[PDB]
Amino acid sequence: ANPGFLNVDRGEVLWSEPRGTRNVSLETCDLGEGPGKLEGAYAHLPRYFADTGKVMDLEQRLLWCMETIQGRDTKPLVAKPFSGPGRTSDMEDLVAFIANKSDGVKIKVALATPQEKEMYAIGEALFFRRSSINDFSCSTCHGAAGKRIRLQALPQLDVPGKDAQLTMATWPTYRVSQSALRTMQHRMWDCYRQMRMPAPDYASEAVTALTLYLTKQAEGGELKVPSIK
């Protein structure tokens, strides 16, 4: 009854498929819980990785793994990260699969390094940053409780709490009107679009920072993914 499981199943196949110049699968990729360990990984991202010295969200981490473990060139994925009619996205399918291995697990990002603390702070600044021709910031629409834009209820995302827990515990999600499973990368892209901003670069630092800020607000939220909206 939930078409998002079509993506979960394709991501499972991709996880085990040899690719790249090294001709190996992604089965040894470390997503923060140890090489190859899937359960609970999504619930604990974004986080600092010692091998890159960067804070990384899941999609950034998957790109790095493809490049370094697989020797698979990621220019094609980055060029077309979101699926459309007759064209699936390896990134969306892998995210569906990996996020579902955290289904039932409570969100918990520890700000355990100076790099995570700084990335969190950059996310907070981006959240309140008013720019472009409508003067919008994220906080314009998501900074107060119980508001709506037309008949679309707005979650409050600037404080820890039920709204943030419920938002972040339900991505990735099947979006009915789009007939596609979408990830937090697509949500941020769509948010920026609506603010009359340029499109953010896929798997960019800005998106990671915002993701970390939101995920920290969502701490304790029990993942139920893929969702349907």
């Binding site: 700084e118 702070a121 950059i122 907070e124 600044a125 981006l126 309140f128 940053r129 008013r130 720019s131 472009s132 021709i133 409508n134 003067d135 919008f136 910031s137 906080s139 314009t140 629409c141 900074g143 119980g146 508001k147 709506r148 834009i149 037309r150 008949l151 707005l154 679009r193 609506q194 009359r196 901003m197 340029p198 499109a199 953010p200 670069d201 960019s204 630092e205 800005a206 998106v207 920072a209």
Partner: protein
């Protein structure tokens, strides 16, 4: 106090690298946007006074009467398109007034980010002086309330003078459904 890392600017510059012609302007903040961002829309009395003064001088009033066509204003209010990277060229921009405000009391699809504007003109006895204040509000909201969440439609070039005159008529014309 918690303060924004300097790296924020660099993160923006390097995360937004496919830019429609001219859309670099969109990444850079003007002084009012910067103050409102850092004070989280709560400026000091001194900062508020400065913002209102700087914004007021930017307002361009019509040469003649302020009220346009309410029927065309209804269209400005309802239209939430324009200005987005996915919008094809030639797209007419609306004010998306309904996103934030109740306006026609019969229209059930309206947001709550802004105050109810039902009977706005009637409440003010259809005053021409109040119509001009409303024109100013739509043109640059921050001239009168510092760090308002309302977009600066006229000054930012989102709406033309005629569209603003039309939406003021939607608020003030006694025949507008807003006032009925």
């Amino acid at each position: 106090s918690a303060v924004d890392p300097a790296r924020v600017d660099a993160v923006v510059k390097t995360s937004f690298t496919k830019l429609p012609e001219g859309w670099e302007s969109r990444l850079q903040q003007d002084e009012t946007q910067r103050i409102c961002s850092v004070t989280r829309n709560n400026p000091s009395p001194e900062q508020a006074a400065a913002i209102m003064k700087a914004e007021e001088v930017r307002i361009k009033f019509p040469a003649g009467p302020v009220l346009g066509s309410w029927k065309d204003g209804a269209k400005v209010a309802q239209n939430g398109r324009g200005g987005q990277f996915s919008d094809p060229p030639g797209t007419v921009s609306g004010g998306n007034c309904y996103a934030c405000h109740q306006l026609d009391p019969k229209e059930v699809s309206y947001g709550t980010l802004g105050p109810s504007l039902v009977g706005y003109g009637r409440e003010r006895n259809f005053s021409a002086e109040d119509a001009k204040i409303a024109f100013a509000k739509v043109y640059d909201a921050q001239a009168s309330l510092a760090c308002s969440s309302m977009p600066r439609f006229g000054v930012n070039g989102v709406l033309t003078e005629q569209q603003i005159k039309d939406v003021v008529a939607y608020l003030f014309d006694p025949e507008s459904p807003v006032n009925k």
